[PDB]
Motif scaffolding. Structure first.
Motif, short mmCIF file in Angstrom:
data_model
loop_
_atom_site.label_atom_id
_atom_site.label_comp_id
_atom_site.label_asym_id
_atom_site.label_seq_id
_atom_site.Cartn_x
_atom_site.Cartn_y
_atom_site.Cartn_z
N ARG B 35 0.87 -1.17 -0.08
CA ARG B 35 -0.04 0.01 -0.09
C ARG B 35 0.98 1.24 0.01
O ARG B 35 1.66 1.53 0.98
CB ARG B 35 -0.99 -0.08 1.09
N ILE B 36 0.78 1.94 -1.01
CA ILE B 36 1.67 3.21 -1.24
C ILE B 36 0.58 4.49 -1.24
O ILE B 36 -0.26 4.39 -1.99
CB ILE B 36 2.58 3.13 -2.37
N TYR B 37 1.01 5.38 -0.48
CA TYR B 37 0.18 6.70 -0.54
C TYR B 37 1.13 7.82 -0.72
O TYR B 37 2.27 8.02 -0.10
CB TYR B 37 -0.55 6.91 0.76
N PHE B 38 0.87 8.85 -1.72
CA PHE B 38 1.81 9.71 -2.09
C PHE B 38 1.76 10.96 -1.15
O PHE B 38 2.57 11.59 -0.82
CB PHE B 38 1.54 10.30 -3.41
N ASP B 41 -1.15 11.09 4.23
CA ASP B 41 -2.69 10.52 4.24
C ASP B 41 -3.06 10.14 5.73
O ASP B 41 -2.60 9.48 6.41
CB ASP B 41 -2.53 8.90 3.49
N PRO B 42 -4.27 10.74 6.02
CA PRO B 42 -5.04 10.62 7.31
C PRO B 42 -5.69 9.22 7.49
O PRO B 42 -6.60 9.21 8.42
CB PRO B 42 -5.90 11.66 7.50
N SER B 43 -5.24 8.31 6.67
CA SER B 43 -6.00 6.84 6.76
C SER B 43 -5.39 6.04 7.79
O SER B 43 -6.08 5.19 8.14
CB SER B 43 -5.91 6.02 5.43
N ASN B 46 -8.03 6.85 11.85
CA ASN B 46 -9.62 6.45 11.68
C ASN B 46 -9.45 4.98 12.53
O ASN B 46 -9.66 4.15 11.78
CB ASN B 46 -10.29 6.81 10.61
N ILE B 47 -9.20 5.05 13.71
CA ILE B 47 -9.43 3.71 14.40
C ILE B 47 -10.54 3.33 14.76
O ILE B 47 -11.31 4.03 15.42
CB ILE B 47 -8.43 3.77 15.85
N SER B 48 -11.10 2.00 14.14
CA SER B 48 -12.19 1.37 14.61
C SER B 48 -12.24 0.11 14.92
O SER B 48 -11.17 -0.52 14.53
CB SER B 48 -13.13 1.36 13.24
#
Lengths: 299, 48, 48, 296, 295
Positions: B35-38, B41-43, B46-48
Motif C-alpha cells: 500500500r503506497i500513498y503519495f 494520508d490521514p487513513s 481513523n481507528i475502529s
C-alpha cells in the motif's frame, strides 16, 4: 461537571480567535517614546479583517429615493446615462417596479403617487426611451445607511449580511408582495433558499414592457432554475418568438435571471411598508448573505 | 490488513543497503501486498 | 402615569438522568472510545 | 458546524470497514442537510430504485448536496460540506486518465457495474456517483438529447441499429456505454426547446453566413470544408436561395441578427452543458487522488 | 497562496520602472505551480505560437488568473485570487471602469503600437484586457462580423463597411478594431468559429424539418405550428431540389444531429463570458479600482 468547562473553553477559543482576526501583535521594539493615547493604540492596533462585508459609498440625487430613504434594505439599480455629469444614476427597485407590467394598477398608481416629481418623470422617460432595459440599467446591491444630505449618500452591500456598523439590527431585503413568485413543486422545500431576480419583457403591440420578478427556490443550479422558468414562462416566450424577428430593437432574449444571494426559510416574514400613509404589502426577507452571480439569459 | 498497525506500532530499523531499489520494485510489482500513498494520508488515524 | 409593575420569568426545572425512574431500567457507564467502537457484542454459552 | 456524521442502521463487517477505509476522500451526495446523517439518506441508492432512469438520476443528482468523505471512526462516518473556492483532495472513481487543469462535473454512475465491491449491506448499497471531465459530461448529455431526437422516430430494429452504434464511446482510451433508455416524456420537453431554438437560428440567421459557406468553398479548400460540402450535398431538404446578398448599409441589422443567433446557440449550449463542480490543480502520480479549488 | 516569478534574462532600469508602473495587473498562468519562469509567464507563450481565437478564447477561459502584488529586486510576487474576497486592479484598458460593473477578460487586440510592455529577448509580455461585459459581447460580435465579411469579394463598399465595423464607441472612448483589410498582423482568422456558426445556420432547418414530420399531431401543438411559422416566414420557398428527397437513412439523421450538437460545444468558447471581477469602488482619476473576485 466535565461538560460546562469544555463549553467555556470553546467560548474562550472563539473569543480569542475573533481577537486574533481583529488585532495584530506588534514586534516593533517600542522604545517607550510615546504618549499614552498612541501607547494604547499601538497595543490594540485594529484591522478590518472583522466586518467581512463588502460595501460601496454612493452619491445619488435625493429626488429618486423617496420611500427608500426611510426603510433600509432595498435593491438598487445602476442606470448609466449619456450625460457626462452623473454618468451613473441610482434607481430604486420600487421605482422601476412602477413601470413593470406585473404590478396591478392600484399598486402602480399608489407608488406612482409616492414617485411623482419632475426628476423622476424625466428619468422614467429616459428608461422608456432606452431600447431594452437590462444592460442600460443593472443590478447593484442592497441599501444600508441612507444619509439624506443634499445629494444623499448611500452605502450599498455587494457581499455579506446587510449591516452598517456595530453589527446591529441587520437589515433585510424588502420585496414587494406582487412582484415575486416561487415556481417549485413544493414551496420552501427543506431549508434555506436562494433568491433570484428575473427580468422578463412583454410586448403589447406598440413597445416593450419590462417586468420584474423575484423567485425563491431551493435549487442552486442555474440550469435547473432556467429549466423551471421556461416551464413557468412558456406562453409569453412563444409571443416573443413572434416578436423578436419583426423587431429591430437590439435585444436577443425573453428575460434574464441573476442571483441575489442566500436567505433563510424561517426568516421569511410578511408585513407592509408605509410612506405618506400608503400601506403597501411587502414580504420581508430577514437575513441575507448577498451573493451576486452573472446574468443568465433565456429566450 | 494491518497497514495502520504498521504505520502506528513501533518498528525495527534495518540496513540501508537492504532498502535500496524500492521505487522500481514497487512500480514493477515485485511484492504482492503493498500500500503506497503519495500525499500525507490521514487513513491511519481513523481507528475502529 | 402609566406604571409597569414587576417583571417575572420562568424557572426551567432541571432534569438529572438518575432522578427520573427510567434509570432503574438503565445502567449507564462512560467509555471514552465509544465513538471509535464499531461493534460491541456479548456472548452467551448455553448448555441443555 | 461544517460536519455531517453518518451512522449506519444495519451492522457491518470488518471487510466492510476495511473497504470504507480504502474509500476515503470521495464525494458523496446527501439530500438531508442535517448535522447527523444515517444510512437511509447516505448515497444515491435511496433514489436508484425508482425507475432507474439516467435522466432522472441526473436531474436529482443536480438537486443533491455534495459532501466529502472523511475519518471513518467506528460505524460513524464524517462528511465535510466543502466551502466555495477552497482546496480539497478527491479520490477518483471514474475510469479515466484525469489530466490536470480541466474542469470536473459529477455524473450518475454508469450501469455497466459489476460486483458492488465497495458495499452491499442489508438491502442497501452505496451508490456513489462518478466524477468526470466536463467534456465527456457534455458528450454523454449530447448522446441523451440525440437518443430523444431518434427515439421520436418510432421504428423496429432501427432503434437497435442506432443505439448499438451510438452508445459505446471512447474518450481517452476508455470504452463506456449506458444501457436501457426507455425514452420517457421528460426528455421530450428538454428537447422541445432545442427544436425551438434551432427554428430561431433558421429564422434569424443572416445573409452573410449561408453565403460564407459558398464563398469559402469558392475561395479556399480544406478537409473540414470537404466534409462540410459532403454534409451540404448529402442533405437536400433545404434550398431557399435568396438571390441578393449585396449588404448595402445593413451593418446594424447584421449585428443585431448575429447577436440573436449567438444567444440561441448559448441557449442550446446551456441545455447540454453540465455544471463544473471541480477544478483540478495537483494530481498524484497514481491518478488516484487529486486536489481541486472550487465549489459551486 | 502566492507565486514567485524569476526572470530569465537581465532587466533594464527602464524595464524595472515599467514593472513599477504595472505593479498591479492581471496575468494568466498555465500551471497552478509555485515557481514559474518568465518564459512561462504571460499569454504570449500561447498566442502567436498556436491556434487563433477559438483555442485562445478557450484557453483564456481555462487559465489561472493571478494579479501582481509586489516587485522585489528581481522577482515578481503574484497572488492568485480567492473567490468571494476583494482584490485590486490597475487600469490598463482604454475603456473607463465604473462602479458596480461586471468585468471579464478578452484576448488582446492586434496592436503592434502597444509597446509590448516587456520585450525580453524574443519573449514579450501580453495581457488579456479587463473589460466590461457589454463591451465584451460587442467586441465579440464585431470581430465575428469582420471575420465573416472578410472572405466575401466584389463589394464596392467593402472598405467603408469594414471601417464602420471597426469603429466602436463606448462612454466617449473610441477604439479601432485592428482587424482591418486583413493585414494579417494578428487577424486571429476565426475560421473554425465561422465554419461552425454557418454549419449551425445551414443544418438547423433540415434537422428541425425532419423532426417536424414526426411526433406532432395532437400534443406537440405549441411546437409544430410555431415551427411552421418560424420556418415558413423566412424559408417561404424551401425544398427546391426535392422530390427525390425527404428520406432518412436514420443513421444519416443521427449523424446530422450529432454533428450539429458537436458544433455547439465547439463554439462554447463564444457562448458565455464569465464575470471575473465585480468592481465595487473606483479610485479617483480612474487609475485603479478595488474589485471583488468571482469565478
Amino acid at each position: 461537571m466535565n461538560s460546562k468547562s469544555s463549553a467555556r473553553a470553546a467560548i474562550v477559543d472563539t473569543v480569542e480567535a475573533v481577537k486574533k482576526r481583529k488585532y495584530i501583535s506588534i514586534e516593533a521594539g517600542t522604545l517607550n517614546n510615546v504618549v499614552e493615547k498612541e501607547r494604547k493604540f499601538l497595543k490594540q492596533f485594529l484591522s478590518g479583517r472583522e466586518n467581512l462585508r463588502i460595501a460601496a459609498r454612493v452619491f445619488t440625487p435625493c429626488e429618486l429615493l423617496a420611500p427608500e430613504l426611510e426603510n433600509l434594505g432595498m435593491l438598487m439599480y445602476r442606470f448609466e446615462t449619456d450625460v457626462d455629469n452623473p454618468k451613473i444614476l441610482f434607481v430604486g427597485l420600487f421605482f422601476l417596479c412602477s413601470n413593470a407590467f406585473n404590478v396591478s394598477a392600484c399598486v402602480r398608481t399608489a407608488l406612482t403617487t409616492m414617485y411623482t416629481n419632475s426628476m423622476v418623470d424625466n428619468v422614467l422617460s429616459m428608461i422608456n426611451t432606452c431600447k431594452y432595459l437590462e444592460d442600460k440599467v443593472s443590478l447593484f446591491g442592497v441599501t444600508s445607511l441612507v444619509s439624506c444630505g443634499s445629494s444623499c449618500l448611500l452605502s450599498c452591500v455587494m457581499q455579506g449580511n446587510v449591516y452598517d456598523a456595530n453589527k446591529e439590527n441587520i437589515h433585510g431585503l424588502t420585496v414587494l408582495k406582487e412582484i415575486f413568485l416561487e415556481p417549485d413543486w413544493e414551496p420552501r422545500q427543506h431549508s434555506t433558499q436562494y433568491v433570484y431576480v428575473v427580468h422578463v419583457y412583454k410586448e403589447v403591440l406598440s413597445k416593450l414592457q419590462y417586468g420584474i420578478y423575484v423567485v425563491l427556490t431551493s435549487f442552486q443550479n442555474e440550469d435547473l432554475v432556467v429549466d423551471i422558468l421556461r416551464q413557468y414562462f412558456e406562453k409569453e416566450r412563444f409571443l416573443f418568438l413572434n416578436y423578436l424577428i419583426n423587431s429591430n430593437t437590439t435585444l436577443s432574449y425573453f428575460g434574464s435571471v441573476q442571483r441575489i444571494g442566500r436567505c433563510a426559510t424561517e426568516d421569511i416574514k410578511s408585513g407592509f411598508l408605509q410612506y405618506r400613509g400608503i400601506t403597501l404589502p411587502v414580504i420581508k426577507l430577514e437575513n441575507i448573505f448577498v451573493d451576486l452571480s452573472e446574468k443568465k439569459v433565456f429566450v | 490488513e494491518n497497514w495502520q498497525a504498521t504505520e502506528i506500532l513501533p518498528k525495527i530499523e534495518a540496513p540501508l543497503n537492504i532498502f535500496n531499489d524500492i521505487k522500481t520494485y514497487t512500480a514493477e510489482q515485485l511484492f504482492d501486498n503493498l500500500r503506497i500513498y503519495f500525499g500525507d494520508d490521514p487513513s491511519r488515524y481513523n481507528i475502529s | 402615569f402609566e406604571a409597569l409593575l414587576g417583571i417575572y420569568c420562568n424557572k426551567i426545572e432541571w432534569i438529572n438522568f438518575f432522578t427520573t425512574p427510567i434509570a432503574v431500567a438503565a445502567n449507564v457507564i462512560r467509555f471514552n472510545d465509544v465513538s471509535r467502537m464499531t461493534l460491541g457484542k456479548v456472548l452467551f454459552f448455553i448448555q441443555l | 458546524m461544517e460536519t455531517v456524521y453518518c451512522t449506519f442502521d444495519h451492522k457491518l463487517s470488518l471487510s466492510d470497514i476495511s473497504t470504507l477505509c480504502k474509500l476515503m476522500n470521495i464525494v458523496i451526495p446527501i439530500p438531508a442537510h442535517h448535522h447527523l446523517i444515517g444510512s437511509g439518506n447516505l448515497g444515491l441508492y435511496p433514489i436508484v430504485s425508482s425507475n432507474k432512469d439516467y435522466v432522472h438520476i441526473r436531474n436529482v443528482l443536480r438537486t443533491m448536496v455534495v459532501t466529502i468523505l472523511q475519518k471513518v471512526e467506528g460505524n460513524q462516518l464524517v462528511l465535510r460540506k466543502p466551502m466555495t473556492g477552497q482546496q480539497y483532495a478527491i479520490k477518483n472513481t471514474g475510469p479515466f486518465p484525469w489530466e490536470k487543469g480541466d474542469t470536473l462535473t459529477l455524473i450518475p454512475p454508469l450501469s455497466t457495474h459489476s460486483e458492488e465491491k465497495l458495499l452491499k449491506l442489508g438491502d442497501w448499497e452505496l451508490t456513489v456517483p462518478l466524477v468526470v471531465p466536463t467534456a465527456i459530461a457534455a458528450e454523454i448529455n449530447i448522446r441523451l438529447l440525440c437518443i430523444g431526437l431518434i427515439a421520436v422516430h418510432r421504428e423496429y430494429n432501427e432503434m437497435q441499429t442506432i443505439i448499438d452504434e451510438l452508445c459505446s464511446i471512447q474518450y481517452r482510451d476508455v470504452l463506456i456505454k449506458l444501457p436501457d433508455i426507455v425514452n420517457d416524456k421528460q426528455s421530450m420537453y428538454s428537447m422541445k426547446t432545442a427544436c425551438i431554438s434551432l427554428s430561431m437560428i433558421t429564422a434569424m440567421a443572416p445573409d452573410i453566413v449561408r453565403t460564407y459557406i459558398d464563398r469559402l468553398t469558392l475561395e479556399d479548400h480544406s478537409m473540414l470544408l470537404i466534409k462540410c460540402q459532403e454534409l451540404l450535398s448529402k442533405r437536400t431538404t433545404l434550398s431557399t436561395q435568396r438571390c441578393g446578398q449585396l449588404h448595402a448599409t445593413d451593418i446594424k441589422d447584421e449585428l443585431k441578427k448575429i447577436k440573436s443567433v449567438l444567444t440561441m446557440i448559448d441557449q442550446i449550449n446551456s441545455l447540454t452543458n453540465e455544471k463544473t463542480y471541480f477544478v483540478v490543480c495537483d494530481v498524484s502520480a497514481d491518478n488516484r487522488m487529486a486536489t481541486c479549488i472550487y465549489k459551486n
